[PDB]
Amino acid sequence: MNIFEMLRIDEGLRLKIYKDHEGYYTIGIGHLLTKSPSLNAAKSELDKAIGRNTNGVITKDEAEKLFNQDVDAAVRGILRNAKLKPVYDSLDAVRRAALINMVFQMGETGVAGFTNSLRMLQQKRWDEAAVNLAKSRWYNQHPNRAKRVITTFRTGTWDAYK
Numbered sequence: 001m002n003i004f005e006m007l008r009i010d011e012g013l014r015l016k017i018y019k020d021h022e023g024y025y026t027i028g029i030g031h032l033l034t035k036s037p038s039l040n041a042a043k044s045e046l047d048k049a050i051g052r053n054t055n056g057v058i059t060k061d062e063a064e065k066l067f068n069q070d071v072d073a074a075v076r077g078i079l080r081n082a083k084l085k086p087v088y089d090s091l092d093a094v095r096r097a098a099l100i101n102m103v104f105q106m107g108e109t110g111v112a113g114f115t116n117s118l119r120m121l122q123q124k125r126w127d128e129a130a131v132n133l134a135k136s137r138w139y140n141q142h143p144n145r146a147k148r149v150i151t152t153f154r155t156g157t158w159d160a161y162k
């Protein structure tokens, strides 16, 4: 299993502009287009992202290209963040994917705000970090996904996804 397959599972694949769980305009494999409530606005960001007049529909290749770019931006992001880097550096391979998953979803800023859980991850106190992670809006609004991520951090294995 690997991060791409992992997120492909958490995000799914949609070729037409849709509303995510928070109600924002997204496409592809979890690619957020805009937080704005305007469809045209969303349409414009898409055209711009893709580089063509899309009319809100893309192809698989196109979805995949944005997904490559977004996973890349996420890794880089983490590696560029003073708070996230040290954590990432401390982890093993599986768990590193789990951290990428969260930053993909919420952004660096978002994740960098889990101060406490982060410190617990750095310290390798898996069951404690897991409990702390669950005490969050993130967990409360997306229980199933958060559980998978959390179990990965707890176990260091891919069982939640197998």
Ligand SMILES: [Cl-]
Pocket (backbone or CB within 6 Å): 049
């Ligand atoms: Cl983009």
Ligand SMILES: [Cl-]
Pocket (backbone or CB within 6 Å): 141, 142, 143, 144, 145
């Ligand atoms: Cl859920």
